[PDB]
């Protein structure tokens, strides 16, 4: 019922604060990101400049919290800057799969009516078209471009508008408010009804999640200025999560968009990564590959899921083959940040499990073993537009109700 | 007239707290300090349990922020459990100078008189001896023995008599108060005037120092579990707050009583030492040392020098010597948690350690003596309003 | 018919006496019992420490050649202290399988009926609800608690109770006796029949079985301060004795409780070990399991086994595997304390040896069954 | 005083019992001893089966302890054949200074009168013109000859006189004697007193000398099979006991003859020498500089010295110079077989004592007595009376310290 004792207390102001001290801390970090396609680069203290400009740049042409953005790019490097200062100001981002159908696409906005969006150059014609549809989307700017494209405004042309040569992102500051109130990300995710919803995601959810990142056991235990892969959609909580808790501990990050098979071991080998973090289908291709030892994976210090890896002794076939401790494994993960209670390889902080009374509700002893429920601040604070999701996932009194017993 | 914005914000809670976060997290690191003439070794974990027990321990003994107790003890590797869990209950400690003749010693602990005190084996008699001269000296507890001594009680006899067998430091909580107000530390020196004087350190400055050790550019960029050496008396406030500093970042400590340069090279070379905070002194034996040259001195990646402006420029010497990035340190002023005002990893290195002042200096400092124990009048002398101290003459800044 | 002229003549002395003098030469091995699973260690110097002080302790308390004491722990690396002090004081001790049912624990300790009783954590439980049956079994005593537990006593506190700070090992004497007639210890298996009997043995078979570990061509050639193996049960005749004689030799020794895995390749390789000792099971797998090859065995120059692996010809596989050209061969009877014929064996004849059990404990005339009227079996 | 607690107890039997042993025990090594001027080689087990077959031969011939036999050679191989036997037997040796005049020579050998004489071929001309002098001396074997010369026997004509092909040292037995009693050695020292004397070295001394080379404080702390380098007189205390106490720890010998120069610069980097004991003026030679710099410390583990070093300190110089923990000094008078003070790991050897000599009467004093002391000199009572007390201790020479 209580979890286990925090091993680093959760930061108690919002993740722009976090994230901005994360940048100003480690600036001095020169790989920051990487393209692994392209070997494209940019640097800790790139994104910090990048980010309070756009943040500034954001207020100036006149967003608050009653606003809503959107972000949507295939993992880019450029991701990151918009992100991060939309969480500055404390304006809700709105992540969007780059990969939907345009009518995917309009539901999926038409829920969190964003009133600007930023997309990669891949992604711009895609968003223009979709933009005919939708009233509401007033501005579109473009993430990896140094130049204006057909009248579309590039982050660069855009921050310039607003932000002159002497600015200096260390005399910045982030806005401050309730990090357990304020909407930091609308995530969308579909469920058993099937219809697109779309998820309410808290600043202290990320500060929290960070702490699990800090975390010497059930978290990552690698160095700063030490190479880490990024492959999962930074759209998916599992993507976009797993990244950013990657800048409060300042770790370099080699970054991969889709899957390329081997190409996926290339970069491991050639950039001497020490952990990656990767979804099933990647362990079971991990647990089962045609010659996997032709590449020297011996950097590969850490390996983490989330996706729960059902059995089969993956977990041990990836432990055993790459000289690597125990995998991070127990409990099915959910959309709303994932990570819940966890055994490393002996054999969750901020987290609560509940146990007793099927047809009552209130006790403090996990004894018996009936049915099972969660209440963490971690969790979606429910779905956006619609009220009625938010009370039949999560019930009267802050619980989530679970599914079994 | 300002410092650098703070990379880390400072932990708003107890200095305590803080440490204890720290032996938490760090638990896994075995050889958490090693006595380098000895080869003793203790964990993090061992650290974290015995802390954590003597807390209760003295808190259950009955002391509280209204009591003080006392430490009295050379370099010594169990140095830091009584330091520790006085810091967790918001008992005020005070560091003794374990060299100190008896008429001296008698004075500082008749400043901020402790009924409580701990020492080594080495300064038991001598605590004896000066016990007799105290009726406010109650208890004596010895640090580094795991019996009695003669019917003097040891930390571990000590702690069992009030904890079991089943005891968790991770069910333990540190207690809560404004670590603002709540004296951690109280260090004797004496300079100005004559007398000896006892000043006062609050929690805050502790938290405010180990932002510093943790700055980038100020600190140290060592990462965990790698070992670092510590030679400072842990009496002073250089060496005291110097070797406070290690656990919040989980370095592995090789700590030394005596200098003797030979096995101080023998030890770096053999423990693998990648930093080194260090007096003028030793700091001149580096440059101008042939055996300096006998030992592999390669896993020294960064070096630092507190204590005193080591006068002309034997800096840049020894820094081209074992191939250091250039050691830069600062002047550590007085004995308000020694550093202060330090010297850049980013910058030009001019001539004096100017520099630009360290996050949330101005002086004014959240980090500078509450004022000394209990003399108001001098501590009008040094601090006034609003809380500025302007002692060592001079007027040079030049931007910044 | 005799075997080899023995290289290194027997200490005359008690084992015990043999162990004080061995754990006072090293003391200076600072790494000599690690616990593979939890990286905690154990100084010679700490067990020379303890183990003279748990022997005055014992004296004091008030007991002598007419007691026994006994132990119940699981491969520990806190076992040597209560054994080697009562081989310094000339108690004889019991050893106990650890992994009894209570049922099989009463009839061991019926047996020798020992008044006093060190054990592990683990073991505590169990030995508390067996110690209920037995009205024999007076004290308790914890090894590896720096703690007592529930009104029950840990070695410390035993030790305080009757040494101060100021006890040094170094002015410690062990007791004088023909070793060669004071049962050392008193181990329990089934032979003769299937029924639980317990086998005397003697000072003079642990000198002897350190002859042989001293042996340079029937036993290891590794010299002091160098990584060893330690898996078998401290409770079987086979892993105490194997362990003993890490001892005199001045051997580090890195232990594991549960066999084993690729754990067991991990730590040979980063512990560097250079020798192991090992039965069938291990050598079997050593031989097939194919992680043999990412792991860096190139340390292990040694190789021992001792419960008859040639069956197949597995040793002449597994010799081949490791770069270890020879493997130590390994008789086992447990009423023969450990080993008698390998590739004979010093103090040793055939058809016979001073390091041959003393027979059975108390009322068991198997003793006249298993060792006939002259000493041969 | 008392000393440390011996952390190996000394060895109960003969001396010749420990070292027959220890050559059985240690057969394995091949490079058993090595002639640094000549590359010549002798392995354990050569020892070991040259030793025994010696000894039954001086059986044979008609010797026991009421005999005594000499040996005169420069630091040889061969040298520790007819020693090890003579220690098997009980028949006392007398080793004699290879460099002596006739005069001396003469002198020596009427101290102990030993029938029988083994020499090197160097030494065999010069022992011939000396025997011509002294009715006593029997027999000459020589001991690095494997063809007799002229007449005069080498060890090999005559063990092969009294032992076949199928002898076997395993199956050989030394005998047994009170160690306390039986003069091992009859050595020569420069007792200033105004003439020379021969000292007596009883079986028990060796036995000891052997518990401090295994005592891990002060003595050597190196494994079996590792090179050392011998150069002291093999006719000294110095020389043959630190030489001695090689062979129960199975070290393997690296030997030079004559005094030094750069030959003795050269053999440590090439043997790869893991420990050194020197005279004194060979470590004030160590106090120069000829580099030639062979990577010799990468072995050089221990150093030690003994006869008269500090004068200026040269310890700590040599110490950090070639990277030694600190080197091991020692002071002991041939009289004392060996050292018997020492320094440790850290900043009065095992079965030896001391005390203040209070000169006029006194025996207390503020702030030896060894079984390892000479049993006196030999035919001489009135030295022997002087030099040891009548309970047993010696005074040394000068107050201290």
Same mark, same amino acid.
């Given at each position: 019922?209580?979890?286990?004792?925090?091993?680093?207390?959760?930061? @108690?102001?919002?993740?722009?604060?976090?994230?901005?001290?994360?940048?100003?801390?480690?600036?001095?970090?020169?790989?920051?990101?990487?393209?692994?396609?392209?070997?494209?680069?940019?640097?800790?203290?790139?994104?910090?400049?990048?980010?309070?400009?756009?943040?500034?740049?954001?207020?100036?042409?006149?967003?608050?919290?009653?606003?809503?953005?959107? $972000?949507?790019?295939?993992?880019?490097?450029?991701?990151? !800057?918009?992100?991060?200062?939309?969480?500055?100001?404390?304006?809700?981002?709105?992540?969007?799969?780059?990969?939907?159908?345009?009518?995917?696409?309009?539901?999926?906005?038409?829920?969190?009516? @964003?009133?600007?969006?930023?997309?990669?150059?891949?992604?711009?014609? /895609?968003?223009?078209?979709?933009?005919?549809?939708?009233?509401?989307?007033?501005?579109?700017?473009?993430?990896?471009?140094?130049?204006?494209?057909?009248?579309?405004?590039?982050?660069?042309?855009?921050?310039?508008?607003?932000?002159?040569? #002497? /600015?200096? @992102?260390?005399?910045?500051?982030?806005?401050?408010?309730?990090?357990?109130?304020?909407?930091?990300?609308?995530?969308?995710?579909?469920?058993?009804?099937?219809?697109?919803?779309?998820?309410?995601?808290?600043?202290?959810?990320?500060?929290?999640?960070?702490?699990?990142?800090?975390?010497?056991?059930?978290?990552?235990?690698?160095?700063?200025?030490?190479?880490?892969? #990024?492959? +999962?959609?930074?759209?998916?909580?599992?993507?976009?999560?797993? #990244?950013?808790?990657?800048?409060?501990?300042?770790?370099?990050?080699?970054?991969?968009?889709?899957?390329?098979?081997?190409?996926?071991?290339?970069?491991?080998?050639?950039?001497?990564?020490?952990?990656?973090?990767?979804?099933? @289908?990647?362990?079971?291709?991990?647990?089962?590959?045609?010659?996997?030892?032709?590449?020297?994976?011996?950097?590969?210090?850490?390996?983490?899921?989330?996706?729960?890896?059902?059995?089969?002794? $993956?977990?041990?076939?990836?432990?055993?083959?790459?000289?690597?401790?125990?995998?991070?494994?127990?409990?099915?993960?959910?959309?709303?940040?994932?990570?819940?209670?966890?055994?490393?390889?002996?054999?969750?902080?901020?987290?609560?499990?509940?146990?007793?009374?099927?047809?009552? !509700?209130? #006790?403090?002893?996990?004894?018996?073993?009936?049915?099972?429920?969660?209440?963490?601040?971690?969790?979606?604070?429910?779905?956006?537009?619609?009220?009625? +999701?938010?009370?039949?996932?999560?019930?009267?009194?802050?619980?989530?109700?679970?599914?079994?017993?």
């Amino acid at each position: 019922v209580n979890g286990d004792r925090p091993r680093d207390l959760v930061f @108690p102001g919002t993740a722009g604060l976090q994230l901005y001290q994360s940048l100003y801390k480690y600036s001095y970090i020169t790989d920051g990101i990487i393209d692994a396609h392209t070997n494209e680069v940019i640097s800790y203290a790139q994104i910090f400049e990048t980010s309070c400009r756009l943040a500034v740049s954001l207020e100036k042409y006149g967003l608050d919290h009653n606003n809503v953005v959107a $972000i949507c790019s295939e993992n880019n490097i450029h991701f990151f !800057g918009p992100l991060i200062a939309a969480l500055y100001q404390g304006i809700p981002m709105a992540t969007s799969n780059d990969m939907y159908t345009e009518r995917e696409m309009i539901g999926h906005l038409n829920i969190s009516k @964003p009133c600007l969006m930023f997309c990669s150059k891949k992604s711009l014609p /895609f968003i223009l078209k979709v933009q005919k549809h939708l009233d509401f989307l007033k501005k579109v700017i473009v993430i990896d471009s140094m130049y204006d494209i057909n009248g579309v405004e590039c982050v660069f042309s855009f921050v310039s508008r607003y932000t002159d040569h #002497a /600015f200096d @992102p260390v005399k910045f500051n982030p806005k401050e408010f309730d990090p357990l109130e304020r909407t930091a990300l609308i995530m969308t995710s579909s469920g058993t009804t099937g219809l697109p919803k779309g998820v309410v995601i808290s600043h202290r959810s990320i500060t929290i999640r960070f702490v699990h990142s800090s975390d010497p056991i059930y978290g990552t235990r690698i160095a700063p200025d030490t190479s880490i892969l #990024a492959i +999962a959609p930074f759209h998916h909580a599992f993507g976009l999560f797993t #990244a950013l808790a990657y800048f409060p501990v300042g770790l370099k990050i080699v970054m991969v968009k889709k899957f390329e098979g081997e190409f996926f071991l290339k970069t491991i080998q050639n950039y001497k990564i020490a952990s990656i973090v990767v979804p099933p @289908p990647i362990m079971v291709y991990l647990a089962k590959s045609p010659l996997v030892d032709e590449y020297n994976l011996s950097s590969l210090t850490e390996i983490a899921c989330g996706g729960s890896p059902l059995g089969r002794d $993956i977990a041990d076939k990836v432990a055993k083959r790459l000289k690597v401790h125990g995998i991070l494994q127990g409990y099915g993960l959910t959309e709303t940040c994932s990570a819940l209670i966890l055994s490393p390889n002996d054999r969750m902080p901020y987290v609560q499990v509940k146990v007793i009374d099927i047809n009552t !509700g209130k #006790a403090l002893g996990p004894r018996e073993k009936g049915e099972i429920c969660f209440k963490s601040q971690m969790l979606m604070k429910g779905y956006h537009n619609n009220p009625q +999701a938010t009370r039949d996932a999560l019930d009267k009194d802050g619980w989530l109700h679970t599914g079994d017993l």
